[PDB]
Design a protein around this nucleic acid. Structure first.
Length: 75
DNA sequence: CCCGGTGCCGAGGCCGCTCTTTTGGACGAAGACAGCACAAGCACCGCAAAAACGCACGAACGCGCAGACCCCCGCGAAAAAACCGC
C-alpha cells in the first residue's frame, strides 16, 4: 500500500465523525478501506491516462479526470 | 222524313304595336393615343465562412544540483476487543 496507515486512519475517522459520534473501528476495516481506495484510484488513473493519451498528450489534467468520471457515470 | 232556331268553328279582317335605316360635298392642321405590372423559377456568378491542417515562437514545465524536512522505519509497552464456548 502506497498511502501510509496512520494518516489514512485519521482521515477515515475524521470522515466517520459526521455520521455517528465516537465510533470504534475493527482490525480489518481500515485495511480493506485502504485497499479499495487504492484500487479505485489506480483504475481512475488508468482511465485518466487513456484520456490524456487520446488527447495526444502525456500529462494528465483535471479535465481528463472529469471526463473519466462522467463516462463511468460518477457524480 | 220534316220544322224551329241557336251556338259553335273557319278563313279572314284589322287594329295597336315593335323593329330598321337614314341623316350634303370637298379641303386643311393639330393633338392624343396605340397590352401592362407582376410572378416563380432556371442556370449561373459570387462572398463569408467552417473544421481542420501547417508553422513559429515564447514561457512554464522538466531536468539537474545542493539543501532542509518529516515520512518512514524500527523499537518496546499496555490492554481493548476479537474469536470461542455454553
Amino acid at each position: 500500500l502506497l498511502i501510509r496507515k496512520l494518516p489514512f486512519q485519521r482521515l477515515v475517522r475524521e470522515i466517520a465523525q459526521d455520521f455517528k459520534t465516537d465510533l470504534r473501528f475493527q482490525s480489518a476495516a481500515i485495511g480493506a478501506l485502504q485497499e479499495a481506495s487504492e484500487a479505485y484510484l489506480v483504475g481512475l488513473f488508468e482511465d485518466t491516462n487513456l484520456c490524456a493519451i487520446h488527447a495526444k498528450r502525456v500529462t494528465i489534467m483535471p479535465k481528463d479526470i472529469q471526463l473519466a468520471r462522467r463516462i463511468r457515470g460518477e457524480r
